[PDB]
Design a protein around this ligand. Structure first.
Ligand SMILES: *[C@@H]1O[C@H](CO)[C@@H](O)[C@H](O)[C@H]1NC(C)=O
Ligand SMILES: *[C@@H]1O[C@H](CO)[C@@H](O)[C@H](O)[C@H]1NC(C)=O
Ligand SMILES: *[C@@H]1O[C@H](CO)[C@@H](O)[C@H](O)[C@H]1NC(C)=O
Lengths: 50, 28
């Protein structure tokens, strides 16, 4: 990202922070939330298998 | 005679100084 020198962080439409400045280094970091998703169980009937 | 166009003013300076400002002057 092309952060302007005054910007401490950046944010998405949800107001969630997308990117930040580090307080101990002049660097700008992207933040990606952790991988997640539905756990779906594919099964035959318990009459037939576990 | 202020030229037409578009510009975005950027913050540079921040002063915690609490001055009551109901007036101002220009130093030519
Ligand atoms: C954090 O520490 C490093 C190493 O001493 C220094 O270079 C850097 O300027 C410091 N950052 C801030 C924001 O004080
Ligand atoms: C499962 O269903 C079959 C019919 O397709 C039946 O013969 C069998 O006894 C059933 N088993 C259990 C544990 O209910
Ligand atoms: C600033 O000064 C004006 C008088 O010129 C006064 O009416 C106003 O209440 C003052 N504001 C503050 C925040 O002190």
């Amino acid at each position: 990202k092309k952060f302007l020198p005054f910007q401490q962080f950046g944010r998405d439409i949800a107001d969630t922070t997308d990117a930040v400045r580090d307080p101990q280094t002049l660097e700008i970091l992207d933040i990606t939330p952790c991988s997640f998703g539905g756990v779906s169980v594919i099964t035959p009937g318990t009459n037939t298998s576990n | 005679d202020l030229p037409q166009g578009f510009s975005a003013l950027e913050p540079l300076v921040d002063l915690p100084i609490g001055i009551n400002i109901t007036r101002f002057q220009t130093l030519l």
